[PDB]
Design a protein around this ligand. Structure first.
Ligand SMILES: CCNC(=O)CCNC(=O)[C@H](O)C(C)(C)COP(=O)(O)OP(=O)(O)OC[C@H]1O[C@@H](n2cnc3c(N)ncnc32)[C@H](O)[C@@H]1OP(=O)(O)O
Ligand SMILES: C[C@H]1O[C@@H](n2cnc3c(N)ncnc32)[C@H](O)[C@@H]1O
Ligand code: MET
Lengths: 353, 626
RNA sequence: GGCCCCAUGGUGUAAUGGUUAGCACUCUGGACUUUGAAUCCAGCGAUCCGAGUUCAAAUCUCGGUGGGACC
């Protein structure tokens, strides 16, 4: 609500605002992924990014006239993960010159390879639309889609493969119906996939499908016994680490944290030596005003404090680092002030000794 | 993450087959093996070491009586109990060993380039001498014939908006898919003078064609689960293994641990699991064979062993067991046959819980990765720290002493024993390096090991499994093809009267027992050693053995405990006061002192107080075992 | 003053002596981290009241309620 003159003035003023903004995310493409643009975005408080992968095969890119290489995507992933942002990929099933088995294999590869192991996932099925070259290609009767049952089976198989840490955000496009030459009838697909996977008796483990909010609103199940869980893997050379509180018996989840060791090669010198970055932290549920304490529910019981102290202990001992840095939203900084965290550049930081 | 361990082997020499072996097949149900010789067929059961039937197409007339042709292919058939056979002259014949019903079933006006059999035994497919392919039904009725070198990428096409190696044989190669629906040919291109590959469907429609790639090899092997087809290629400085898809495009590869232009390579073999893969190398002016493994898109050379190229000891051929994925057969020109087996394991370590560090070791290449878990947790690949070695290691083991289970032993390929002690060594030998824990400024305060000894042997695998009962006493097992039995060994420590990194350990004694000792284990707290015989018999051997102390394991009533099956592993436990035994099989079957208790178990563990299990029904549970 | 006629979802309506009143407008929810409103899917609504009869009643009877035209 304060008129400003530059970016920095607005930043300083929004620091003390009460709306309490917590971040922004932007789309991009790997061409604009050099450290210059990353430093630029550091000045904006952005947190997550969109790229658009569309494949796992280089040939397809030139086939699709994408105009770049999958390699550049891979180094963009590595560099961004080293910096400390989050990333969401776009997957593009049923493409020209792609068999169904090709789709299955590439989707399996998307998680089997330590090269990618991404965090955010979005899927968009092919949709032939007038105006594009593909419109004439299909019109020439040379690009054919699948039957709806095939798409249902494809999605059902895919959902069985998602690693637990990955979270799906959306399925299918939102294009108006009377425009697509191959648009499926169903505006709803996740439900059809759920029916199919009930038929096959195999379950999915997506984050969105195991948080308290969705699980309660769709099945009315109350957590009873919540405990901790720890896991780790390797991605883009990183020693990633994932922490959570959740109730396993109903497989319902409440709180999560993503923390890793920084790579040996880095762009931000502030991370040089004895530094471990915590990419993100979050507890799901519903909005609770910062002054309000307990409308029953699970958003202010001190849960985050335990995760912070345990992550700090792990970084001090297992990582063997010497200083902890973290990205944060513009308002959220004050939160870390309560724990004795001080600012440095755009990064909140605490000494470890 | 695991590492393979050799379980048991079976060697058989001195086969009196006329002439020399040419090829062979296996009799699955019968348990015997076929033989392709220069004169006729021979069948023998290994454990019998007795030939069953003999024939001679030389005696009949088809096979050159002087001896000039060879058996292109022999393939066992079970429906009719009669084995088909192919002739270098281009003659397909069928016979049964039961009554010698040999009779020509067909021929071509050329030689049989190669004989291929459908994986389901449904169909056959052969190559002629005039560069064409002949497809026929189950009973040799010619389905069709087509010329090999047509001009198209294949029916499966794309929609859109320098020469062969000198050591190449030019022999075409073909393979099936794992589903019996696609097959790939790898004829050398006569036009470009290079190698080319095409793939066809079950219908015999030209599906796809390979792509121009330099340095292509003659080898080829389809992954049994499909979607992957192996090949070899040499690059200006390195020999590598590449993969192909059913689309016939290059995808993925991994290099070799050898130098540029050193050795010749043969084709590639898949286990039944479609998991393990085996590679055959020829010493180019000491052949070898290696077992690779992929994990998390990382390739681990989990095993390897070599051989001499001296004629009789020069190897003839080999084959994966099409039933057990971890069983191998092999035969060499000295008219000798040999069998091998492995099984999985994890190689953990247990000592005094206060002092133990829950260290875990994994083997790859000529190096060992170690991760200590009492303080750290790292997701494979990477590790806490690694130890290097000159040439590839085979298997390792930790010390079995309590409050000391933090020092291990290493067995290199050339009978070398490496000792690494994690004592408070002031200076660290360069062999020790730190993995993810290290970095620019990152620092930890753990205890690292150091090189201690590099011992040798004091009188191809002369010894079997290796165990380290105590700091100075190691144990191993041998075999005997005649009169099947095993021998224990007593390699004590020879004192250091030389370069203090050396010293040859000699056999104090050679304890010999009859039968195959498939497994063995011991307990440090009890200081007792018990083995499992191939029969499932359980025999405690007094490791002290003032005079060859042997005693079959006794039940609560003081009577033998004969396990109903061969266990994949063994274990000792302290249930109440009982020193009962623990074991299981690959069939999820669990038994305790010859009492079956469950059939859903997929894994288990115990650290001195509690037994933990992994049900196939997706569950775990603990028990206070005291 | 009687004769007749009517009383079903919030409204517009089918149905009828027996295991379930079916539609229609309307409203509500999910797909949806682009949508209260769109597309689909899913869901919540009921026989005027009291007496009778009938094994059994919304449909047969009477009474009441309220409403609708008759001299
Ligand atoms: C980094 C950008 N992303 C986000 O912020 C995601 C949204 N964040 C959130 O919803 C919450 O901050 C959390 C996910 C951390 C859940 O909150 P959590 O349960 O861990 O807080 P705790 O219970 O441990 O501590 C409570 C304190 O946090 C304070 N707090 C809550 N929100 C904020 C905030 N934006 N900024 C500063 N302090 C806050 C509360 O005022 C409370 O203080 P109190 O003593 O007066 O009650
Ligand atoms: C937002 C993501 O969806 C893709 N995308 C954008 N428009 C279409 C369309 N009509 N059909 C398919 N994919 C599309 C982008 O290329 C990106 O990957
Ligand atoms: C909206 S399309 C996806 C983001 C961006 N236009 C890209 O293709 O890289």
């Amino acid at each position: 609500g304060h008129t400003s003159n530059n970016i920095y003035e607005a930043v300083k003023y929004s620091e003390r605002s009460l709306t309490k903004c917590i971040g922004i995310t932007i789309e991009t493409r790997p061409d604009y992924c050099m450290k210059r643009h990353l430093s630029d975005m550091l000045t904006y408080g952005c947190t997550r990014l969109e790229i658009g992968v569309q494949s796992v095969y280089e040939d397809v890119a030139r086939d699709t006239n994408r105009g770049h290489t999958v390699k550049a995507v891979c180094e963009s992933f590595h560099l961004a993960k080293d910096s400390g942002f989050k990333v969401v990929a776009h997957m593009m099933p049923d493409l020209p010159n792609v068999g169904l088995e090709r789709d299955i294999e590439q989707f399996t590869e998307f998680f089997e390879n330590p090269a990618f192991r991404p965090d955010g996932l979005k899927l968009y099925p092919t949709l032939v639309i007038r105006g594009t070259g593909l419109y004439e290609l299909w019109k020439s009767g040379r690009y054919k889609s699948y039957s709806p049952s095939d798409l249902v089976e494809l999605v059902a198989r895919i959902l069985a493969l998602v690693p637990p840490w990955t979270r799906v955000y959306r399925v299918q496009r939102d294009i108006p119906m009377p425009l697509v030459s191959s648009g499926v009838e169903h505006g709803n697909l996740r439900e059809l996939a759920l029916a199919r996977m009930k038929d096959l008796g195999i379950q999915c483990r997506d984050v969105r499908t195991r948080e308290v909010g969705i699980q309660e609103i769709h099945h009315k199940v109350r957590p009873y016994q919540v405990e901790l869980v720890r896991r780790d893997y390797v991605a883009n050379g990183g020693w990633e680490t994932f922490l959570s509180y959740e109730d396993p018996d109903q497989d319902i989840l409440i709180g999560l944290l993503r923390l890793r060791k920084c790579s040996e090669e880095t762009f931000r010198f502030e991370l040089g030596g004895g530094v471990s970055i915590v990419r993100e932290l979050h507890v799901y549920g519903s909005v609770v005003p910062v002054s309000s304490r307990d409308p029953t529910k699970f958003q202010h019981q001190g849960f985050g404090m335990l995760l912070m102290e345990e992550a700090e202990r792990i970084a001090r001992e297992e990582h063997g680092s010497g200083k902890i840095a973290v990205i944060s939203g513009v308002g959220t900084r004050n939160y870390y002030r309560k724990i004795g965290y001080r600012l440095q550049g755009p990064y909140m930081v605490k000494m470890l000794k | 993450m695991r590492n393979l361990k050799l379980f048991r082997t079976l060697e058989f020499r001195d086969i009196q087959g006329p002439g020399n072996p040419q090829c062979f097949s296996l009799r699955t149900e019968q348990g015997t093996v076929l033989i392709g010789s220069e004169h006729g067929l021979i069948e023998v059961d290994p454990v019998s070491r007795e030939v069953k039937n003999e024939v001679s197409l030389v005696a009949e007339g088809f096979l050159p009586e002087d001896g000039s042709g060879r058996i292109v292919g022999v393939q066992d058939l079970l429906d009719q109990e009669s084995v088909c056979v192919a002739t270098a002259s281009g003659d397909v014949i069928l016979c049964s060993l039961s009554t010698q019903q040999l009779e020509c079933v067909g021929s071509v006006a050329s030689g049989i380039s190669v004989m291929s059999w459908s994986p389901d035994q449904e169909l056959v497919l052969l190559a002629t001498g005039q560069q064409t392919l002949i497809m026929m039904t189950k009973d040799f009725e010619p389905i069709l014939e087509q010329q090999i070198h047509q001009d198209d990428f294949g029916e499966s096409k794309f929609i859109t908006v320098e020469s062969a190696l000198p050591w190449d044989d030019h022999r075409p190669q073909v393979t099936w898919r794992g589903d019996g629906q696609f097959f790939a040919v790898s004829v050398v291109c006569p036009e470009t003078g290079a190698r080319k590959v095409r793939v066809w469907n079950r219908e015999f429609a030209l599906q796809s064609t390979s792509e121009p790639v330099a340095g292509l090899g003659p080898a080829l092997a389809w992954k049994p689960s499909g979607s992957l087809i192996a090949s070899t290629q040499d690059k200006p400085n390195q020999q590598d293994i590449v993969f192909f898809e059913k689309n016939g495009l290059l995808h993925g590869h991994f290099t070799l641990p050898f130098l540029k232009d050193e050795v010749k390579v043969n084709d590639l073999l898949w286990n039944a699991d479609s998991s393990v893969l085996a590679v055959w190398l020829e010493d180019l002016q000491k052949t070898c064979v290696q077992l690779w493994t992929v994990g998390n898109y990382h390739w681990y050379l989990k095993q390897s062993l070599s051989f001499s190229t001296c004629g009789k000891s020069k190897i003839v051929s080999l084959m994966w067991d099409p039933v057990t994925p971890y069983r191998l057969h092999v035969l060499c020109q000295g008219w000798h046959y040999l069998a091998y087996d492995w099984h999985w394991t994890t190689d953990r370590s247990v000592g005094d819980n206060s002092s133990d560090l829950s260290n875990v070791a994994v083997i790859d290449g000529n190096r060992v990765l170690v991760t200590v878990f009492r303080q750290t947790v790292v997701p494979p690949p990477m590790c806490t720290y690694q130890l290097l070695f000159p040439h590839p290691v085979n298997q390792v083991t930790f010390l079995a002493h309590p409050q000391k289970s933090n020092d291990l032993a290493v067995l290199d390929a050339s009978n070398q024993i490496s000792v690494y002690k994690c004592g408070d060594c002031p200076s660290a030998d360069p062999t020790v390096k730190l993995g993810a824990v290290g970095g620019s400024g990152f620092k930890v305060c753990l205890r690292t090991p150091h090189l201690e000894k590099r011992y040798k042997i004091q009188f191809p695998l002369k010894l079997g499994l290796l165990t380290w009962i105590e700091e100075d006493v190691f144990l191993a097992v041998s075999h005997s093809e005649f009169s099947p039995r095993s021998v224990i060994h007593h390699l004590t420590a020879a004192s250091s009267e030389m370069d203090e990194e050396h010293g040859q350990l000699n056999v104090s004694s050679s304890a010999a027992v009859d039968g195959v000792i498939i497994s063995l284990c011991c307990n440090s707290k009890t200081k007792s050693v018990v083995l499992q015989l191939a029969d499932g018999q359980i025999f405690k051997y007094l490791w002290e053995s003032p005079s060859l102390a042997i005693k079959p394991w006794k039940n609560s009533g003081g009577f033998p405990v004969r396990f109903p099956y061969p266990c994949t592993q063994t274990e000792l436990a302290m249930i109440g006061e009982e020193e009962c035994v623990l074991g299981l099989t690959d069939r999820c079957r669990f038994f305790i002192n010859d009492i079956e208790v469950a059939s859903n178990i997929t894994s288990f563990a115990v650290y001195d107080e509690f037994l933990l299990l992994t049900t196939h029904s997706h569950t775990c549970q603990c028990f206070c075992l005291r």
